[PDB]
């Protein structure tokens, strides 16, 4: 055999360690689409693999060939724990890609309420619109995701209080 990208994707941490021991500065090596092992592990919710890769030297900021990021793939999957680990490394919480959105628009679209709560708590910008002009709250309202809307409303009211 499996590539370093599949080993990371599949949480095969002991094999991934061996691969990186034998190779020359492979941790940030992009595949055909620009994906790093960290983006693969992120996209699969493989928490201790992400931790290990960050510890080894992985760069969480890297964008793939259509601007896909570790944070937007973790947010898409609702993988709250990965979002935390990546935002401890001050990745761009509002990173925008040509698919048309951002981590918060992706967590909303998937009805991933715990990931929406975490991204808001981390300071994600509620005014950052989709390519279509919709804000995250516009999207929650349009989709009828009532709990997601509630947790957006709860956050908005805290932003204006000291």
């Amino acid at each position: 055999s499996l590539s370093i990208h599949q080993l990371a994707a599949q949480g095969e941490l002991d094999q991934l360690k061996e691969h990186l021991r034998k190779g020359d500065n492979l941790v940030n090596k992009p595949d055909e689409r620009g994906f790093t092992p960290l983006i693969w592990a992120s996209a699969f919710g493989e928490i201790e693999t992400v931790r290990f890769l960050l510890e080894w030297g992985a760069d969480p900021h890297i964008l793939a060939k259509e601007r896909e990021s570790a944070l937007s793939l973790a947010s898409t999957g609702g993988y709250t724990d990965i979002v935390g680990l990546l935002l401890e490394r001050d990745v761009d919480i509002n990173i925008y890609d040509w698919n048309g959105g951002t981590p918060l628009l992706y967590a909303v679209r998937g009805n991933h309420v715990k990931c929406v709560e975490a991204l808001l708590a981390r300071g994600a910008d509620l005014t950052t619109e989709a390519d279509s002009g919709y804000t995250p709250m516009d999207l929650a309202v349009a989709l009828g995701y009532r709990k997601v809307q509630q947790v957006i409303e709860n956050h908005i009211l805290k932003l204006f209080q000291s």
Binding site: S72, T76, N99, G100, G101
Partner: peptide, 13 residues
């Protein structure tokens, strides 16, 4: 085992 990268979501509804 061989796994496939998940897509970013479709913002249409």
């Amino acid at each position: 085992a061989f796994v496939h990268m998940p897509t970013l979501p479709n913002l249409d509804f």
